[PDB]
Ligand binder design. Structure first.
Ligand SMILES: CNS(=O)(=O)c1ccc2c(NC(=O)[C@]3(OC)CCOc4ccc(Cl)cc43)cncc2c1
Ligand SMILES: CNS(=O)(=O)c1ccc2c(NC(=O)[C@]3(OC)CCOc4ccc(Cl)cc43)cncc2c1
Ligand SMILES: [Cl-]
Lengths: 299, 302
């Protein structure tokens, strides 16, 4: 029993964290095989082609523990800088670079000066920001998932928006959201609740013996989406309904039956009651996270 | 900016997790240098669990009865001894991944990271607090016994907890790494229950200072209180008494924000009276008590 926000074991990613210093700027890099990946703003209206052409390999100081790596090449791919080094990382795990969609969750290994300091779980918000926990020097920290023994790198941290939320890119340097890596007026758009994730967390509550919110009612997918749009909740699709199938079969509560519970919770509140120790509806657990935690999958 | 429940990086502990098998029982072990530490109930069958005599069960075992697996490699057990509720298996190979470590016994209110494992394989990491009733609100299934709680200081791992059992309310009980249980629990299937739990007051105050550092001031008021008047109110909401030690510990946060501890105590009294009125504090509609004053300073300053 129990239900916690749980991150993937971070060890395979810890063995890849390095410090990258160029001029007066210091941030984190991800060392995989003979390449170090880091935000391109380490070289900083910037003209990154013009700023990069003026740099030599010896301008980038890369440090892995107490060992300095020698940079033998450099190239830019979108908003990520790729530093070719002379030595392949012997701790390189089996890995892939994957771009995730809003609502998907991942683990973040927060780093400062190439040293990991913490791990937390979070979700890609529908407005493409992440509600992270980052200070100055956190740039280059990465987001990931683990499948068996393969690390899927999905996020690299780049900046903090004025509301305290964070923006970054996939490992190919493409930003999540309409953000740019430049000091200019930028803001997070109006955010919405990840509906499929709230439903998955309501199934996790049922599996853990929290059932007060259940009711005898059902609803149509159209009627639920009309209600959800009024409460700034993301639309629920047939794909989301299908994904929730296994949890629906395990608890005996049809997805549209759980939608009627969610509709009653949105129109009436919790009334002093809690669900899994929370007075708010949690949306940072996917249906797969719920199945993984309520069955004990290992890495 | 931002405030998350944050666990320590788990890599130094992952390289210590092994699987320990005794007959039909399998659980997790912690391999440090040439010793594997695990709950002593690995020598019990489901039949032995009500009133087991561990000294009598252990004396009947030989080294080859213990099967220890580290990855796809079987370790050879060359000795065994019991220390309180932990079994210590001497092995023929020192773990080359043994980090710098210490065994520390923690007090209620203190937080730690838990690396949840099954069959010697890590499956997840989360952040916990030792509740005032000496239980932890963990997330554990069958076979999680032997999973460990820890903190990291520089490059040193402080092991503070080893998981042993689940009480009937779904909460968990365990020991320090010397086998001494936290709380009045025993490693027997006899009727046991968690005592009435309370809120960790010093931790709620630390989290209110974290909200002030992140720009939230809506809950502050023009009032102060005596330490005694605060405690009289707090006990009525099942909050732990706040001691002068707690007031002193909050000193640095008080100096950084400019809000005296007893002035923040007056905001807490008001929040307990009025509730939040549809508002949240650091994205939460409840008062968070699983962040210590030390966690707040580390996450907000470095
Ligand atoms: C709010 N103060 S803080 O917590 O120390 C902080 C400061 C900077 C943080 C940070 N850095 C940045 O956003 C910038 O990094 C150079 C600052 C200047 O403006 C830009 C513009 C574009 C880009 Cl891509 C980056 C930055 C990242 N993540 C978290 C940060 C927490
Ligand atoms: C509630 N079902 S479950 O989630 O699968 C589960 C089952 C057993 C869990 C478990 N095991 C135990 O508590 C016991 O382990 C042999 C079961 C029998 O009673 C005792 C008595 C004393 C001691 Cl020290 C251990 C046990 C631990 N932690 C979490 C557990 C989740
Ligand atoms: Cl302590």
């Amino acid at each position: 029993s129990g239900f916690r926000k749980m991150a993937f074991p971070s060890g395979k990613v810890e063995g890849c964290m390095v410090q990258v210093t160029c001029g007066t700027t210091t941030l984190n890099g991800l060392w995989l095989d003979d390449v170090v990946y880091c935000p391109r703003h380490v070289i900083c209206n910037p003209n990154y082609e013009d700023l990069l052409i003026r740099k030599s390999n010896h301008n980038f100081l890369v440090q892995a523990g107490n060992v300095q790596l020698r940079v033998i090449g450099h190239s830019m791919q979108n908003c990520v800088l790729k530093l070719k080094v002379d030595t392949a990382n012997p701790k390189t795990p089996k890995y892939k670079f994957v771009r995730i969609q809003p609502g998907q969750t991942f683990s973040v290994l927060a780093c400062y000066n190439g040293s990991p300091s913490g791990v937390y779980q979070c979700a890609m918000r529908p407005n493409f920001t992440i509600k992270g926990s980052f200070l100055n020097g956190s740039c280059g920290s990465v987001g990931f998932n683990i499948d068996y023994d393969c690390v899927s790198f999905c996020y690299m941290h780049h900046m903090e928006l004025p509301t305290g939320v964070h923006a970054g890119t996939d490992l190919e340097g493409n930003f999540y959201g309409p953000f740019v890596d430049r000091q200019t007026a930028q803001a997070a758009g109006t955010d919405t609740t990840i509906t499929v994730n709230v439903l998955a967390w309501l199934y996790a509550a049922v599996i853990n013996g929290d059932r007060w919110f259940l009711n005898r009612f059902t609803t149509t997918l159209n009627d639920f989406n009309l209600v959800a749009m009024k409460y700034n909740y993301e639309p629920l699709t047939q794909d989301h309904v299908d994904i929730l199938g296994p949890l629906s079969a395990q608890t005996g509560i049809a997805v549209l039956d759980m939608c009627a519970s969610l509709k009653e919770l949105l129109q009436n509140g919790m009334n002093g009651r809690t669900i899994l120790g929370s007075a708010l509806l949690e949306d940072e657990f996917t249906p797969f996270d719920v199945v993984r935690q309520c069955s004990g999958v290992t890495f």
